[PDB]
Every structure is written in C-alpha cells, then in structure tokens.
Symmetry: C4
C-alpha cells in the first residue's frame, strides 16, 4: 500500500483539476471537481471545455491523469474491495 500513495496521487490530480476548471472555466468547485472525475475516468458526460486554454490543459490532463486514476481504481478493486467482499461472505 501503494494504495494510499495511489489514493493521494489521485486526490492531488483531482484537486489540481478542481482548481484549474474552477478558475479558468469559471466553474463552481463542485462542477469543476465533477468534470475532472468524469473526464479522467472517461465517463465524460458533460459539455466540453469552452476555453482554448481549457481544451489544451484538458488534453494534457487526460494523458497524464487517466493512467493514475485507473491504477487507483484497479488497486482499490483488487486490494480493497475484493478482501472486503470476500470477508463479508465468510459464514
């Protein structure tokens, strides 16, 4: 764990996104955070960024961030969720 470092790295990445989109795209922080989340996890169900600076940043953000996010989701699943789910089936 590894898991913790992964979790922190993600939090950091999301905070940076939240600050950026909140500042540059003029989004409320909750909307800025959400964009960051649905974008990196590829859910992306939002309109696109309106600013060229947002567009460029988002492009770099996606390539730098996806890998980390999915490594986190992967580690979360394989090392946190699986053992909890497993334990909860011990009769």
């Amino acid at each position: 764990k590894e898991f913790q470092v992964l979790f922190v790295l993600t939090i950091l990445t999301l905070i940076s996104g939240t600050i950026f989109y909140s500042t540059v795209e003029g989004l409320r922080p909750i909307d800025a955070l959400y964009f960051s989340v649905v974008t990196l996890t590829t859910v992306g169900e939002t309109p696109p960024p309106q600013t060229d600076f947002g567009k460029i940043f988002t492009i770099l953000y996606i390539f730098i961030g996806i890998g980390l996010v999915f490594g986190f989701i992967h580690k979360l699943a394989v090392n946190v969720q699986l053992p909890s789910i497993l334990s909860n089936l011990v009769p």
Copy 2:
C-alpha cells in the same frame, strides 16, 4: 462459477442502488435512472450530467466504487461465460 454469480449479484445490487438514488433524487423515471447508472459505470456515459449537487457528489463516489465491479463482471462474463459459449458454437 460462484465468482460469476457473486459478481452478477454485486452488479445488480449496485445498479439497483443507482436506480433508486437517481430515480428519487434526480426525479428520473426508474428506466432512465437505471440507464444513467449503466452508461455511467461502464463509462459510455452519453447523457447530460446530474442536475443536483447531491447527485454530483454521489455520482462521483458511485463511479469510483462501481466501475471496478462492473468491469470485473464484464470481464468474468466474457472470459468464463461468453468465451466457452461462444467457443463451442464452433465445435463441428
């Protein structure tokens, strides 16, 4: 398996929870609530975003907690249900 069934139940549960939540909080018809849940977790996710802050927060936690399970299911479905059945189908 046992694994496949557990995976299938876990998914169903996750989807039902989503369905209940989005139907209640976002005021969505259950079929629309179910669909949002499915396309969101599988990352399709091709609808407008949630309109409530509570929907937004939940959906964020939902995505991180749920994606892994969903894809583990799709993975097990594919590798242990579709492939064998599927494979023969080609048995002459």
Copy 3:
C-alpha cells in the same frame, strides 16, 4: 486467429445494433451503425436513445457487447497492429 472469429463476432454485433437502432430509434443506418460503435467502445458522444425499448436494449447491448469489442480491439492491436508496426521498422 481467433482474430477472424473476433472480427466476425464484432461485425455481427454491430450489424444487429445497426438493424435495431435503425428500425426502433428511426435512425439512418449510418447513424445507427455509429451509435452502436461509439456506445460499445464507450466513446459514447451521442444523445441517448429516445425509446424505452431502445434504453432497455442498449443496456443489454452494452453488457453483452463491450467485452467482445474490446477483446477484438485487444487482439487487433496485439496480433495485427504490433507485427505490422514492427515489420515497418525493420531496416
């Protein structure tokens, strides 16, 4: 190969989608095909289905189809694209 079977399975899946969305959602076949593709590959950048029958079908379609599609993309990449790219670097 394996690749071929994968390729056929995909084609079949996409054709079924193309017929369905074209018929039920009243989409032009090119738009029906496209929906099927961007949905299964999860790109999904289209409005959602308008009919409840479309919504239900699409739900089953996604769970049955994603795995096949990505198995195809995976096999395409690892067994078709890699050897071509590799060959094309032999000086």
Copy 4:
C-alpha cells in the same frame, strides 16, 4: 525505452491525422479538431458527434485503429515513465 518513444510518435501521428481530418472535413478549428481526436480515442469522448457522413465513417475506423495505440501509450507512459518518476519522489 525506444518502445515508449515509438509509442509516443505513433500517437502523435494518429492525433495529427485526426486533427488534419476533422479540421478539413468537419470544418473544425485545429484546436477543436485535435481535442475531438483526443477525447474520442481515449473514449472520454464528451462532445457532440461528427456532422458529416464521411466524418462518421472515418471516426468509426479511427476509433478501432486508434484506441489500442492510445491506450498502449497511456499504459507504457504510466508503467515505464510515471511509475519510476513517481517512485523516487519517495526515495528519502
């Protein structure tokens, strides 16, 4: 590596081709054409769909040919560039 660089070049190439195509055919500003290409291949893909049938056909072939490369890149980037650099960063 060599692998990382080749992967990086292949991606750049793929994106440039997309940029040229969508900018020309869909009449998109290059920055918008580039962005569409990126969010589409990485599957984000959160914009309206292509408006031309030629755009639609191309984008279909683009997706199947390009996703694999893009994700192989993101994978190699992550596993061989970010992880080491990254790892130390934690070296005390």
